[PDB]
């Protein structure tokens, strides 16, 4: 595979074999008082600063030069220009990849098939702006003349995770917006428990689906419409309570949504890159279109940083390369995302899709199988909660787990004169310091001596109190979690993922790996119906089905 | 360490090295049409059936024999009996480990320091029973005479995750219960956005903390008490609105809680095993004490299954050993938990603590350092959502990821004449079948040719459409997600974790690894007050602190 044959990759591997032992953080920081300045970036966006501190990673200045040489060798910069220029870099599907066009506030032309996409992008944005104004002001009335109080997004995956994570994160900005609800699972619990809390007369349903064929979303949408028409008893009332966010005009009409009620996007918007498009309508409705424009603007700023910054000081490139270093030299399977912010409690789940569906790949551009690791398993929970759930394993288990810690300097809720946020910041700082420094047998012994432990009791406990440390982290600190700054942060990680993919020579923008499960579920669905035993699959699938059939009528 | 020198483990690794490439699920099923019957367990709890189908795993009958022999050689049964009989198996802390006593419906004596703990367990249960009846009936009034409409648990980690996951899982059983809120993060967002939705006259605060010294929880409690007293202006009225769940009567009283309002538990209740104790009061308030008892009864049933069942047919032992196989032979870092149930959306989060804080360890019982892997990283999201987020990587990435798929046969919401649950089940079944059966180049070519792809479109797309499969899963299917069945499922995984700890020779029940972060946060705290630079740490901690100071 390309990466394995790359001479810069082999130098990195070779260096790792010879010098891995020189990578002790305790020693590196002691021998370089300037380490933080040398291994950090400060970004002034004009709407907040972002500090990307990667100095607690197991790198030296030689390692980062070799990693930048790898990005050059693998053609990161030329691949970047192909994306921004509208070339069909999604080569398995023959598509452009232009989530950057969605937030292209400069309106500089971006050509696909020689045609500028920005007129159509801005036509849909204008349509969302006007609709949001009418809904939020109460000028858009329901079928009994009431204003809309609840907006329900029905969609899954790329049509759900982004809008949910952003509306969660920007909750302080939703004064005067309708309540927003997200129904995604086919599990009837999800729609049922939501509809039970709603009035059809004041509820606006948004059917989010790129294809408008996804079984979960269409089934959920048909259930919501049946429920709604149970109350309204008039087909023409659907036009006041159902809109669609899709590329598929034909299926939207067949579902019965008026064409004036369809907000379009395009095939070069990948679902996991789609919150910047019409899929973001639930965001604009909740926090207002002006805050949505700020979100796009912050992404635009990061796009420009990614495009114009030399690789060696380019935030998403450096994050990408650090991950390559941990994935392909150290062998780390996972990457933890640990925001110290309750509003970001859906941020890790969002990049599970964004990262893992993009780079969970094993075939290269040339059709050949990779002979190296690709994308990691992404996981995490907000701090401080994670400290009391799983940091035990991060500190004193047997796995190496690169961790991104994120926090805003300014809280949306400066209660008790800042007391809570002070404690939060201090834990944020303490945990990376603890991961890096650890605690030696000599340091733990001195503590147990001072606690007054008997020699027997002390030798028994001592090895359990030792922290081997040397566990690497990234610390990403930003002024405040505004719409603009959220946009910049999400875009930072989008381009991190793009860079890793180029390095691995995979297609970050397709998802052929979801097809087989879909096919097999279509075959199983009609077999579940009766009480007849199923014997047509492997023995486990049959046995599970037959157990299901048996237990259907247990009371 | 103990494990790597154990004869049965070495036999296990040697077989792996010689026969790894013989393990192909597609061929194992093709050659043994009885594979499901020999590699699954069906449990009748008398309150629902559990099918534990472990046949889509990379195991033969010989591998399962060697694994059970490892369990015997590592002494699982004798360790289990020490736990149930009240011995101090949490050896670093010198404590028993008796979450099983908390749900011991049988009331068979369990001695700790020679004294039966069951009377104290049942005294507290009776007290929660009576408090819940009063609150739920409206007998218990607020400081202005109103009934409690909102209950707010304040607590973190083990004092949060269990009750949150259970009340989320048992939502359908909460009719007539007050609404329940969980406040855990120190991040002031968490208490602030909760308090903004509450009426102090009708809100009941539960301060859940085993130590009653955790900084996050005591600060949140102090903030809620300040907020409450700003409205009531009557300090006697705290006794109507604040209770405590703790082992520390001194700190509870010094905080201002009436002694009558403390619900006790004991040092042998681990935080991440605590939802079965007083820590579960918010569960019993939300769904009723009878449903809480049913939850306890399910766990009790699983405790007896674990205790009385021969190892080769013992559900938590088999799950543990299959994990050992993937962890210590295949080298899998992670274990995914994928419940096909929206009510179980915090189940995986609960076992991140349950599993990872228990067995994320590296020092054995003799004080020696492990030379093998221990606990995995636990992660996951509910199906079907996960299919559209990260299953692309499970199917077509470069990682081997053991997965548990869980689902209830009967849904709490049989809308559309069961159409949604029918689809949910079909996806549950399809995904494990797909992970096991890939799709060959040959099969993918035929589909593309049949679809009508031209030779150039076909050959460009074909390699990307191949699924190598051979990806192992457990399927855990149960009649219905009732309180009883939830209790059984949680206890099953608790005992899974126990068994793995014993085999690894580690302490599943301490958590010394949380102490260095707490120390260092206490030293950084006062340094944030100034506008002065800070120079007292490493450059990075210094540099971050000073950027925080610049950007206030």
Q: Are B161 and B217 in contact (CB under 8 A)?
A: no
Residue of A nearest to B52 (CA): A544
Q: Is B115 helix (H, G, I), strand (E, B) or coil?
A: strand
Residue where the block lists tokens 């299919």 = B387
**At A150, phi and psi to the nearest 5?**
-135, 135
Name which of B156, B342, B521 is nearest A388 (Cβ-Cβ).
B156
Q: Is A147 helix (H, G, I), strand (E, B) or coil?
A: strand
Q: Long-range contacts for A526-532 (Cβ within 8 Å, ≥24 apart)?
A: A528/B422, A528/B425, A528/B426, A529/B422
| Binding-site residue ranges of A | 158-159, 209-214, 353, 357, 388, 518
d(Cα A160, Cα A216) in Å, to the nearest integer? 12
Name which of A187, A438, A467 is nearest B341 (Cβ-Cβ).
A187
Strands (E), B168-222: 179-183, 203-208
Q: How far from each other are the two terminal CA atoms of chain B, in whole angstroms?
A: 50
User: Which of B370, B496, B362, B503 shows the shortest CA–CA distance to B6?
Assistant: B503
Q: Is B111 helix (H, G, I), strand (E, B) or coil?
A: strand
Inspect the interface and report whether the beta carbons of B414 and A188 lie closer than 8 Å: yes
Name which of B48, B55, B342 is nearest A185 (Cβ-Cβ).
B342
d(Cα B176, Cα B287) in Å, to the nearest integer? 8
**At B269, phi and psi to the nearest 5?**
-100, 105
User: Which of A202, A181, A201 shows the shortest CA–CA distance to A192?
Assistant: A181
Alpha helices in A157-214 (DSSP H): 161-169, 188-195
Query: Which residue of B208, B366, B389, B417 to mutate against A (max A Cβ within 10 Å)?
Result: B389
Would you call the peptide bond into A490 cis, given omega within 30 degrees of 0 as the criterion?
no
Query: Which residue of B182, B328, B343, B429 to mutate against A (max A Cβ within 10 Å)?
Result: B429
Rg (CA), chain A: 26
d(Cα B157, Cα B155) in Å, to the nearest integer? 7
Token pair of A502 as six digits:
């180029």
d(Cα B359, Cα B504) in Å, to the nearest integer? 9
Choosing from A201, A216, A293, A357, the catalytic residue is: A357
Q: Which residues of A touch B427 (CB under 8 A)?
A: 186, 517, 521
Choosing from A193, A388, A413, A422, the catalytic residue is: A388
Q: Which residues of B touch A214 (CB under 8 A)?
A: 388
- Which helix (H) or strand (E) element contains residue A504? helix A483-504
Task: Work out the number of other CB atoms within 10 angstroms of the CB of residue B19.
Answer: 12
Q: Are B177 and B285 in contact (CB under 8 A)?
A: yes
Residue of B nearest to A335 (CA): B377
d(Cα B474, Cα B472) in Å, to the nearest integer? 7
Q: Are B282 and B167 in contact (CB under 8 A)?
A: yes
Inspect the interface and report whether the beta carbons of A219 and B160 lie closer than 8 Å: no
Would you call the peptide bond into B384 cis, given omega within 30 degrees of 0 as the criterion?
yes
State how far residue A109 is from chain B, nearest Cα, in angstroms: 30
Inspect the interface and report whether the beta carbons of B409 and A36 lie closer than 8 Å: no
Q: Which residues of A touch B528 (CB under 8 A)?
A: 422, 425-426
State how far residue A127 is from chain B, nearest Cα, in angstroms: 28
Strands (E), A430-523: 473-480
Q: Are A173 and A291 in contact (CB under 8 A)?
A: yes
Structural domains of chain B ordered from first start: 1-98+294-514 (3.40.50.10490), 99-293 (3.40.50.10490), 515-552 (1.10.1390.10)
**At B203, phi and psi to the nearest 5?**
-120, 130
Resolution in Å, one decimal place? 1.8
Q: Are A545 and B429 in contact (CB under 8 A)?
A: yes
Q: Is B211 helix (H, G, I), strand (E, B) or coil?
A: coil
DSSP structure string for A269-280:
S-GGG-TTTGGG
User: Which of B403, B386, B341 shows the shortest CA–CA distance to B169?
Assistant: B341
d(Cα A534, Cα A322) in Å, to the nearest integer? 50
d(Cα B405, Cα B401) in Å, to the nearest integer? 12
**At B282, phi and psi to the nearest 5?**
-70, -30
Q: Are A20 and A63 in contact (CB under 8 A)?
A: no
State how far residue A108 is from chain B, nearest Cα, in angstroms: 32
Query: Which residue of A54, A374, A392, A542 to mutate against B (max B Cβ within 10 Å)?
Result: A392
Token pair of A419 as six digits:
């007391």
A220 DSSP 8-state letter: H
Q: Which residues of A touch B357 (CB under 8 A)?
A: 389-390, 392-393
Inspect the interface and report whether the beta carbons of A525 and B401 lie closer than 8 Å: no
Strands (E), B232-344: 242-246, 262-264, 334-339
Q: Which residues of B touch A90 (CB under 8 A)?
A: none
B178 DSSP 8-state letter: P
Choosing from A72, A518, A522, A523, the catalytic residue is: A518
**At A4, phi and psi to the nearest 5?**
-60, -35
Burial B318-349 (b: 16+ CB within 10 A, else e): bbbbbbbbbbbbeebbbbbbbbbbbbbbbbbb
Would you say B213 is a known binding-site residue?
A: yes
Inspect the interface and report whether the beta carbons of B42 and A547 lie closer than 8 Å: yes
d(Cα B530, Cα B534) in Å, to the nearest integer? 9
Show the CA angle centred on residue A364, arms to residues A362 and A366, nearest 5°: 150
Residues in chain B: 552
CA distances from B112 to B94, B96, B121, B248, B295 (A): 12, 7, 12, 19, 25
d(Cα B55, Cα B35) in Å, to the nearest integer? 6
CA distances from B518 to A424, B62, B63, B215, B388 (A): 12, 47, 43, 9, 38
State how far residue A395 is from chain B, nearest Cα, in angstroms: 6
Q: Are A540 and B56 in contact (CB under 8 A)?
A: yes
Query: Which residue of B45, B163, B189 to mutate against A (max A Cβ within 10 Å)?
Result: B189
Show the CA angle centred on residue B538, arms to residues B537 and B539, nearest 5°: 115
Token pair of B466 as six digits:
């191949």
Paired strand residues for A242: A205
Contact residues for A123 (Cβ-Cβ < 8 A; gap 6+): none
Burial-class residue A530 by CB neighbours within 10 Å (0-12, 13-18, 19+).
Answer: exposed
Name which of A426, A468, A516 is nearest B521 (Cβ-Cβ).
A426
d(Cα A379, Cα B183) in Å, to the nearest integer? 22
Residue of A nearest to B55 (CA): A540
d(Cα B24, Cα A434) in Å, to the nearest integer? 43
Phi-psi region of A86 (alpha: psi -120 to 50; beta: other; left: phi over 0): left
Show the CA angle centred on residue A493, arms to residues A492 and A494, nearest 5°: 95
Task: Work out the number of other CB atoms within 10 angstroms of the CB of residue A38.
Answer: 12
DSSP structure string for A335-353:
EEEEES-GGGTTHHHHHII
Cβ-based contacts under 8 A for chains A and B: 508
d(Cα A543, Cα A552) in Å, to the nearest integer? 14
Contact residues for A380 (Cβ-Cβ < 8 A; gap 6+): A336, A337, A338, A339, A348, A386, A403
Q: Which residues of B touch A539 (CB under 8 A)?
A: 29, 32-37, 55
| Binding-site residue ranges of A for D-glucose 6-phosphate | 158-159, 209-214, 353, 357, 388, 518
Q: Which residues of B touch A92 (CB under 8 A)?
A: 460-461, 464
Q: Is B14 helix (H, G, I), strand (E, B) or coil?
A: helix
Active site residue A518: yes
Alpha helices in A138-242 (DSSP H): 161-169, 188-195, 215-232
d(Cα B258, Cα B243) in Å, to the nearest integer? 8
Burial A455-467 (b: 16+ CB within 10 A, else e): eeebebbbbbbbb
Choosing from B264, B357, B381, B494, the catalytic residue is: B357
Burial-class residue B389 by CB neighbours within 10 Å (0-12, 13-18, 19+).
Answer: buried
Inspect the interface and report whether the beta carbons of B186 and A384 lie closer than 8 Å: yes
Show the CA angle centred on residue A489, arms to residues A488 and A494, nearest 5°: 95
Q: Which residues of B touch A513 (CB under 8 A)?
A: 391-393, 395-396, 467
Inspect the interface and report whether the beta carbons of B29 and A540 lie closer than 8 Å: yes
Paired strand residues for B292: none
- Which helix (H) or strand (E) element contains residue A334? strand A334-339
Beta strand pairing call for A40-44 and A49-53: antiparallel
Q: Which residues of B touch A360 (CB under 8 A)?
A: 390, 392-397, 399
Q: Are B538 and A433 in contact (CB under 8 A)?
A: yes
Residue of A nearest to B440 (CA): A516
Tell me the HSE value of B391 on the side-chain side, using a 13 A CA sphere: 30
Paired strand residues for A154: A183, A207
Q: Are A335 and B357 in contact (CB under 8 A)?
A: no
Task: Work out the number of other CB atoms within 10 angstroms of the CB of residue B377.
Answer: 24
Q: How far from each other are the two terminal CA atoms of chain A, in whole angstroms?
A: 56
User: Which of B204, B85, B113, B99 shows the shortest CA–CA distance to B158?
Assistant: B99
């Amino acid at each position: 595979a390309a990466l394995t044959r790359d001479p810069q990759f082999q130098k990195l591997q070779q260096w790792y074999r010879e010098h891995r032992s020189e990578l002790n953080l305790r020693r590196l920081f002691d021998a370089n008082k300037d380490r933080f300045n040398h291994f950090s970036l400060t970004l002034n966006t004009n709407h907040g600063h972002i500090l990307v501190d990667y100095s607690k990673n197991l790198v030296t200045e030689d390692v980062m030069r070799m990693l930048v040489d790898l990005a050059k060798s693998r053609g990161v910069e030329a691949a970047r220009e192909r994306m921004f220029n509208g070339e069909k870099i999604n080569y398995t599907e023959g598509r452009a990849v232009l989530h950057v066009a969605l937030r292209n506030r400069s309106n500089t032309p971006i050509l696909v098939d020689g045609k500028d996409v920005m007129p159509e992008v801005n036509k849909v944005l204008d349509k969302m702006k006007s609709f949001c104004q009418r809904v939020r002001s109460g000028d858009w009335k329901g079928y009994t003349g009431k204003t809309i109080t609840d907006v329900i997004n029905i969609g899954i995956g790329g049509s759900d995770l982004g809008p949910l994570m952003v509306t969660e994160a920007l909750k302080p900005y939703s004064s005067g917006g309708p309540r927003v609800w997200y129904v995604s699972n086919i599990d009837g619990t999800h729609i049922a428990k939501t509809l039970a809390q709603l009035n059809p007369e004041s509820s606006l349903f948004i059917i989010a689906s790129k294809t408008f064929t996804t079984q979960e979303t269409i089934t959920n949408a048909e259930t919501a419409k049946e429920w709604f028409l149970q109350a309204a008893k008039d087909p023409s009332a659907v036009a006041k309570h159902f809109v669609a966010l899709s590329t598929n005009t034909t299926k939207v009409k067949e579902f019965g949504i008026d064409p004036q009620n369809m907000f379009e996007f395009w095939d070069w918007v990948g679902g996991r890159y789609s919150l910047w498009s019409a899929i973001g309508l639930s965001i604009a409705l909740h926090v207002g279109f002006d805050n949505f424009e700020q979100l796009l603007s912050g992404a635009h700023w990061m796009d420009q940083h990614f495009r114009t910054t030399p690789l060696e000081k380019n935030a998403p490139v450096l994050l990408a390369l650090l991950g390559i270093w941990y994935i392909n030299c150290f062998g780390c399977e996972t990457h933890a995302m640990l925001p110290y912010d309750q509003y970001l409690h859906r941020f890790a789940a969002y990049f599970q899709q964004g990262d893992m569906e993009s780079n969970g790949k094993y075939i290269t551009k040339s059709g050949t199988r990779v002979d190296h690791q690709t994308g990691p398993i992404v996981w995490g929970e907000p701090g401080t909660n994670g400290q009391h759930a799983f940091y035990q394993l991060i500190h004193q288990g047997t796995k190496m787990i690169p961790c991104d810690f994120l926090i805003p300097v300014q809280t949306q809720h400066p209660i008790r004169k800042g007391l809570h946020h002070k404690i939060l910041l201090a834990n944020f700082l303490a945990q990376t310091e603890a991961l890096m420094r650890g605690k030696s047998t000599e340091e733990a012994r001195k503590e147990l001596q001072a606690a007054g432990k008997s020699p027997e009791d002390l030798e028994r406990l001592l090895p359990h109190k030792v922290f081997e440390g040397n566990r690497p982290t990234n610390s990403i600190v930003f002024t405040k979690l505004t719409p603009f700054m959220l946009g910049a942060l999400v875009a930072m990680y989008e381009h991190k993922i793009f860079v890793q993919g180029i390095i691995w020579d995979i297609n970050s923008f397709d998802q052929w790996g979801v097809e087989l499960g879909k096919q097999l579920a279509k075959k199983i669905e009609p077999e579940l119906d009766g009480s007849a035993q199923v014997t047509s699959h492997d023995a486990s699938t049959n046995g599970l089905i037959n157990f299901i059939k048996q237990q259907r009528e247990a009371r």
